Design an enzyme around this catalytic site. Sequence first.
Site, PDB file in Angstrom:
ATOM      1  N   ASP A   1      11.196   2.309  -2.233  1.00 48.93           N
ATOM      2  CA  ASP A   1      10.807   1.854  -0.900  1.00 48.93           C
ATOM      3  C   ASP A   1      11.465   2.673   0.207  1.00 48.93           C
ATOM      4  O   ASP A   1      12.671   2.573   0.435  1.00 48.93           O
ATOM      5  CB  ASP A   1      11.155   0.373  -0.731  1.00 48.93           C
ATOM      6  CG  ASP A   1      10.815  -0.159   0.651  1.00 48.93           C
ATOM      7  OD1 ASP A   1       9.986   0.461   1.346  1.00 48.93           O
ATOM      8  OD2 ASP A   1      11.374  -1.204   1.045  1.00 48.93           O
TER       9      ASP A   1
ATOM     10  N   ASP B   1       6.239   4.387   4.956  1.00 49.81           N
ATOM     11  CA  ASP B   1       6.805   3.285   4.188  1.00 49.81           C
ATOM     12  C   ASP B   1       6.114   3.109   2.837  1.00 49.81           C
ATOM     13  O   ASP B   1       5.050   2.492   2.752  1.00 49.81           O
ATOM     14  CB  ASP B   1       6.708   2.000   5.016  1.00 49.81           C
ATOM     15  CG  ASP B   1       7.187   0.766   4.272  1.00 49.81           C
ATOM     16  OD1 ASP B   1       7.792   0.880   3.184  1.00 49.81           O
ATOM     17  OD2 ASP B   1       6.958  -0.340   4.799  1.00 49.81           O
TER      18      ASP B   1
HETATM   19  C1  LIG Z   1      14.790  -4.347   5.075  1.00 52.40           C
HETATM   20  C2  LIG Z   1      14.303  -4.176   6.512  1.00 52.40           C
HETATM   21  C3  LIG Z   1      14.532  -2.732   6.946  1.00 52.40           C
HETATM   22  C4  LIG Z   1      12.815  -4.589   6.647  1.00 52.40           C
HETATM   23  N1  LIG Z   1      11.831  -3.479   6.634  1.00 52.40           N
HETATM   24  C5  LIG Z   1      10.463  -3.689   6.788  1.00 52.40           C
HETATM   25  O1  LIG Z   1      10.068  -4.851   6.947  1.00 52.40           O
HETATM   26  C6  LIG Z   1       9.380  -2.556   6.791  1.00 52.40           C
HETATM   27  N2  LIG Z   1       8.935  -2.011   5.478  1.00 52.40           N
HETATM   28  C7  LIG Z   1       8.686  -3.039   4.427  1.00 52.40           C
HETATM   29  C8  LIG Z   1       9.228  -2.715   2.989  1.00 52.40           C
HETATM   30  O2  LIG Z   1      10.601  -2.487   3.071  1.00 52.40           O
HETATM   31  C9  LIG Z   1       9.001  -3.986   2.074  1.00 52.40           C
HETATM   32  C10 LIG Z   1       9.680  -3.880   0.669  1.00 52.40           C
HETATM   33  C11 LIG Z   1       9.003  -4.745  -0.418  1.00 52.40           C
HETATM   34  C12 LIG Z   1       8.705  -6.087  -0.169  1.00 52.40           C
HETATM   35  C13 LIG Z   1       8.083  -6.934  -1.083  1.00 52.40           C
HETATM   36  C14 LIG Z   1       7.725  -6.436  -2.326  1.00 52.40           C
HETATM   37  C15 LIG Z   1       7.989  -5.115  -2.622  1.00 52.40           C
HETATM   38  C16 LIG Z   1       8.612  -4.283  -1.684  1.00 52.40           C
HETATM   39  N3  LIG Z   1       7.554  -4.222   1.975  1.00 52.40           N
HETATM   40  C17 LIG Z   1       6.706  -5.059   2.689  1.00 52.40           C
HETATM   41  O3  LIG Z   1       7.213  -5.741   3.604  1.00 52.40           O
HETATM   42  C18 LIG Z   1       5.237  -5.181   2.376  1.00 52.40           C
HETATM   43  C19 LIG Z   1       4.812  -5.044   1.042  1.00 52.40           C
HETATM   44  C20 LIG Z   1       3.478  -5.166   0.608  1.00 52.40           C
HETATM   45  C21 LIG Z   1       3.105  -4.978  -0.862  1.00 52.40           C
HETATM   46  O4  LIG Z   1       2.163  -5.621  -1.366  1.00 52.40           O
HETATM   47  N4  LIG Z   1       3.788  -4.101  -1.702  1.00 52.40           N
HETATM   48  C22 LIG Z   1       3.571  -3.752  -3.114  1.00 52.40           C
HETATM   49  C23 LIG Z   1       4.900  -3.838  -3.870  1.00 52.40           C
HETATM   50  C24 LIG Z   1       3.025  -2.319  -3.197  1.00 52.40           C
HETATM   51  C25 LIG Z   1       1.788  -2.044  -3.794  1.00 52.40           C
HETATM   52  C26 LIG Z   1       1.283  -0.740  -3.859  1.00 52.40           C
HETATM   53  C27 LIG Z   1       1.993   0.320  -3.312  1.00 52.40           C
HETATM   54  C28 LIG Z   1       3.214   0.066  -2.706  1.00 52.40           C
HETATM   55  C29 LIG Z   1       3.704  -1.237  -2.650  1.00 52.40           C
HETATM   56  C30 LIG Z   1       2.536  -5.419   1.615  1.00 52.40           C
HETATM   57  C31 LIG Z   1       2.878  -5.582   2.983  1.00 52.40           C
HETATM   58  N5  LIG Z   1       1.850  -5.850   3.983  1.00 52.40           N
HETATM   59  C32 LIG Z   1       2.183  -6.591   5.222  1.00 52.40           C
HETATM   60  S1  LIG Z   1       0.239  -5.327   3.786  1.00 52.40           S
HETATM   61  C33 LIG Z   1      -0.644  -6.585   2.941  1.00 52.40           C
HETATM   62  O5  LIG Z   1       0.190  -4.178   2.964  1.00 52.40           O
HETATM   63  O6  LIG Z   1      -0.287  -5.165   5.086  1.00 52.40           O
HETATM   64  C34 LIG Z   1       4.250  -5.451   3.332  1.00 52.40           C
HETATM   65  C35 LIG Z   1       8.155  -3.119   7.593  1.00 52.40           C
HETATM   66  C36 LIG Z   1       6.840  -2.412   7.271  1.00 52.40           C
HETATM   67  O7  LIG Z   1       8.452  -2.967   8.956  1.00 52.40           O
END
Ligand SMILES: CC(C)CNC(=O)[C@@H](NC[C@@H](O)[C@H](Cc1ccccc1)NC(=O)c1cc(C(=O)N[C@H](C)c2ccccc2)cc(N(C)S(C)(=O)=O)c1)[C@H](C)O
Length: 372
Positions: free
Chosen positions: A35, A221
Amino acid sequence: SFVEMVDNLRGKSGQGYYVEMTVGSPPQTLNILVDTGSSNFAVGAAPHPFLHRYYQRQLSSTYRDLRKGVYVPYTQGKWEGELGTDLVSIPHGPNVTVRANIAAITESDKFFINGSNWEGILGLAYAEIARPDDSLEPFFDSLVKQTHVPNLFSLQLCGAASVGGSMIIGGIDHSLYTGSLWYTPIRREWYYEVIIVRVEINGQDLKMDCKEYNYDKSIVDSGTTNLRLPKKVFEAAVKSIKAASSTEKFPDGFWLGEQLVCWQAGTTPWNIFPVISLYLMGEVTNQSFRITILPQQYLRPVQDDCYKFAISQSSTGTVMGAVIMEGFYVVFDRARKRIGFAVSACHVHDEFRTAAVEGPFVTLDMEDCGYN
Ligand SMILES: CC(C)CNC(=O)[C@@H](NC[C@@H](O)[C@H](Cc1ccccc1)NC(=O)c1cc(C(=O)N[C@H](C)c2ccccc2)cc(N(C)S(C)(=O)=O)c1)[C@H](C)O
């Protein structure tokens, strides 16, 4: 060197790309989601319905508790756990062992995914967004200071029901991409933020104020599935994809990702779905380059062929997720504060169209595109 790392990523479609790692002494093998959108290294450390296995600090000769708790919220899902340090190694990565911070997940909500086959997450972004605060060293910083591994990694995510790809740690493997690499500056170091300077759909300029694309940020991301856009941009885009494909009709909840659409296998009308070009800030004055994505990237596959619309709205800016990243070889050149894009070796084909990285383009006033 790098041939050992080619194909070191696995995953199920729509469930995330993971790498094999080991923690503790003796080594505990674990699948860790990769990630670039976060900065904490964490693994499940307690039984969970979706977890086939998990980290056991008890059986680690090397585990050290930090007696600090930690809580991490994402856009999707959240967890808390116990901060500690332990020895970590990457089987199909560089031949090294580092002591790194690890969050031991004891509680979580809508984070782990059933069948996904990963038990942890490797946040590869910068300390500035690490939880609890920037004093907690992210894994890759630990790896670089403790070894001679260059401050650089590459991600090549290969799309669709099993996916795969490569995380080249410490360099650039030239057999994994065609053409030239084009680089965009990392604006500051927290997320991997970039600046989008222009957007086209089927070659027509979206004609929006530059700033709208990067409100309040634009990030690369790998932990996010979709291409997420700010409300105003997203509406502009969807209006454009509808009009392009108005020859057919879909329930409105399809454009919201709430419903699928199906076509008899082998008859998917790709032609009526437009290509999307994102222009990124370049390295020299008034210079940019564009990346172009096929509908095969934002219409994700789920008798017939069914798809989900993988462009969504966001209130945290543009998120260039797997939708964008698949079919591109992406170089996270931290040493030079830049991110490179090139057409992936596993770019996925259209009959009469192709994903592309092209330059140089000229774009005036690119710094005005940045949001403050
Ligand atoms: C710690 C702090 C710095 C917070 N950071 C953040 O919030 C930022 N980045 C988010 C990532 O860190 C996190 C890490 C994570 C979370 C949950 C499960 C696996 C991985 N990912 C997500 O929030 C996230 C995940 C998915 C999703 O479904 N992922 C799966 C695992 C996937 C499938 C295929 C390819 C890649 C990943 C969706 C979404 N969506 C909202 S969508 C349906 O695609 O529009 C978001 C944000 C975009 O602003």
